[PDB]
Design a protein around this nucleic acid. Structure first.
Length: 259
RNA sequence: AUGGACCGCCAGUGAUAAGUGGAAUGCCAUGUGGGCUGUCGAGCCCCACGCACGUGGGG
């Protein structure tokens, strides 16, 4: 069976502190563990990186951010723990595996159920596949002309590398076109219309440092005190199309990652 | 065979109609161009003649 894991499979290009020659691609778990070692991890698509730094800020960061500044001058104490871990200069791998451990079997995007940032049921109710060309950026869609980025005629399209596929999926989850995508029925409801992505047409500002760990630490908005939150992949069960997108005072609702 | 290769910004259009630059006005007043002065022997060749002093013909 096909399987890919963000934690173990290599997709994230990584640059080391030394030499600055031959960046190697690594998984998400490895980057997390070897963070002080690497200066940065890079994605060729700025949309892909714009959502990427958002999700990476919810993993390493969440564990370090703690999701809980109650009493004690909240802002002051989070900045105190912040100074404490910033002083350590690194994250203990055992707390990473523990986080990964909670949902270790839930990451491999190609999951039959619970695929990464995806809806698995979707396959059954949509008659026409959008196609890779409609998903991937710089790639021509059905109505798009054949002039740029290699010519894709939408007949025998060359498949995206799985690592490549991951970058695109993440971008479309951030930036995404609005109106007239392919309709899927849900108990009688068919509406090809689609609204735009949450950050669409914007510049995301991520502070950097000398090493990875620094940036990841300095990348988390301070979560105000509020309801405990979780991510789309931290959701216990699927949302369903109908109904209200519930609010989320937690930072996962402030990383625009609740839904 | 280079964020490249292939690749039109493009189809249309009066700036028009009207109009004295016009009225007046001396560049005026003065001045030698002067002295000197007669127009009176190489020249390259051919030929003819010669009293070899020199004559003439032709180019």
């Amino acid at each position: 069976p096909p399987s890919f894991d963000v934690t173990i499979a290599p997709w994230l290009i990584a640059r080391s502190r030394d030499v600055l020659a031959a960046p190697e691609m690594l998984g998400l778990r490895d980057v997390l563990i070897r963070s002080h070692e690497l200066s940065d991890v890079e994605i060729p698509l700025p949309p892909g990186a714009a959502v990427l730094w958002r999700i990476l800020a919810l993993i390493t960061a969440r564990i370090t951010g703690l999701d809980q500044p109650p009493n004690k001058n909240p802002k002051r104490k989070w900045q105190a723990r912040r100074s404490q871990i910033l002083s350590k200069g690194r994250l203990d791998p055992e707390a990473v595996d523990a986080y990964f451990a909670d949902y270790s079997e839930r990451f491999d995007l190609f999951h039959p159920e619970r695929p990464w940032l995806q809806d698995p049921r979707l396959r059954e109710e949509c008659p026409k596949t959008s196609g890779v060309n409609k998903l991937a950026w710089g790639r021509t869609a059905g109505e798009n002309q054949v002039w740029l980025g290699g010519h894709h005629h939408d007949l025998d399209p060359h498949p995206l590398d799985s690592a490549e596929a991951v970058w695109h999926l993440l971008a479309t989850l951030g930036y995404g076109p609005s109106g007239m995508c392919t309709a899927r029925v849900v108990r009688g409801r068919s509406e090809r219309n689609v609204t735009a992505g949450p950050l669409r047409g914007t510049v995301s500002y991520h502070p950097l440092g000398r090493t990875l760990f620094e940036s990841l630490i300095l990348n988390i908005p301070y979560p105000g005190t509020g309801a405990a939150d979780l991510a789309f992949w931290e959701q216990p069960e699927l949302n369903d199309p109908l109904g209200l997108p519930e609010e989320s005072a937690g930072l996962a609702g402030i990383l625009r990652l609740d839904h």
